């Protein structure tokens, strides 16, 4: 998270870490047994780490549950990063508490101007390489599709939305992918991509989760 701030221990309880030796992507806990992430973060043999603030130190509030099923969207395209959504089922149910809690799904899509919370343990430098130990947060407004399409000509699809600043400075970054973009307590987006980090006129693009609410619900029930 470039231009972010320390969230503060377990202030983002729904935030999970997709581990496979090292932290590679983020994610959200939508319910006791299901985690939502980005299809581009798909890896075989994932360990979902919950109750994490400082990823590098075992603060005892952690819960590490292996993934039993990984369900990537059928229409997902790696080239375009369209339909960059993936559902992961936990091997066992996460014990919900204060450090670990779920985030609700949206009933409607958000409007441009809506302030959202974007978080993760990803690169904080738009220039070099610097990764935090603790959880970083960033508040950014959902940009209008007019701005989004003008920022990325011929790249934005109806399943994507821009959030951040055309002045750059603040933006998600490498390693934040899969992470949550929560506006008003609803999971509205998933950290998908962007051209660089905090680049002027190049704000991060996120997966428009409200488009998949139906798919998600049917996927959750059947598996
Ligand atoms: O920073 C980036 C991208 C990463 C994706 N991206 C965004 C932008 C905004 N939001 C989400 C993702 C735009 C910048 N890259 C530099 C690093 N390369 S990399 O050599 O493939 C790479 C990949 C993973 C790494 C992990 C670590 Cl721990 C250190 C260096 C790494 C370097 C990929 C592009
Ligand atoms: Ca820890």
Helix content: under 10%
Assigned CATH class of the largest domain = Mainly Beta
- Strand arrangement, major sheet: 1-9-8-11-12-13-10
Order of helices and strands: EEEEEEEEEHEEEEH
CATH level-two architecture of the largest domain: Beta Barrel
CATH topology of the largest domain: Thrombin, subunit H
The distinct bound ligands, ions and cofactors come out as: the ligand O=C(C1CCN(c2ccncc2)CC1)N1CCN(S(=O)(=O)c2ccc3cc(Cl)ccc3c2)CC1, calcium ion
The counted number of beta strands is 13
Distance between the terminal alpha carbons, to the nearest Å? 33 Å
Q: How much beta, percentage-wise?
A: 25-35%
Q: Which structural class matches the secondary elements? A: mainly beta
What Rg is obtained from the alpha carbons, in whole angstroms?
16 Å
**What would you call the shape?**
globular
CATH level-4 homologous superfamily of the largest domain: Trypsin-like serine proteases
Task: Outline the biggest β-sheet.
Answer: 7 strands, antiparallel
Q: What's the number of domains?
A: 2
Summed up, the helix count is 2
Binding site for Ca(2+): 52, 54, 57, 62
Family: Belongs to the peptidase S1 family.
Cofactor: Ca(2+)
Keywords: Calcium, Digestion, Disulfide bond, Hydrolase, Metal-binding, Protease, Secreted, Serine protease, Signal, Zymogen
């Amino acid at each position: 998270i470039v231009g972010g701030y320390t969230c503060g221990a377990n202030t983002v309880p729904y935030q999970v870490s997709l581990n496979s030796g090292y932290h590679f992507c983020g994610g959200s806990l939508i319910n006791s047994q299901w985690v939502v992430s980005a299809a581009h973060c798909y890896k075989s043999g994932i360990q979902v780490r919950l109750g994490e603030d400082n990823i590098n130190v075992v603060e005892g509030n952690e819960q590490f549950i292996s993934a039993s099923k990984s369900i990537v969207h059928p229409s997902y395209n790696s080239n375009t990063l369209n339909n960059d959504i993936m559902l992961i089922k936990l091997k066992s149910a996460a014990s919900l508490n204060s450090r670990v809690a779920s985030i609700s799904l949206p009933t409607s899509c958000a409007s441009a101007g809506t302030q959202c919370l974007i978080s993760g343990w990803g690169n904080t430098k738009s220039s070099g390489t610097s990764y935090p130990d603790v959880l970083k947060c960033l508040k950014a407004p959902i940009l209008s599709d007019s701005s989004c399409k003008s920022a990325y000509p011929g790249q934005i699809t109806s399943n994507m939305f821009c959030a951040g600043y055309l002045e750059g400075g603040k933006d998600s970054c490498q390693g934040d992918s899969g992470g949550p973009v929560v506006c008003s307590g609803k999971l509205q987006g998933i950290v998908s991509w962007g051209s660089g980090c905090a680049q002027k006129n190049k704000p991060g693009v996120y997966t428009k989760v409200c488009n998949y609410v139906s798919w998600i619900k049917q996927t959750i029930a059947s598996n």
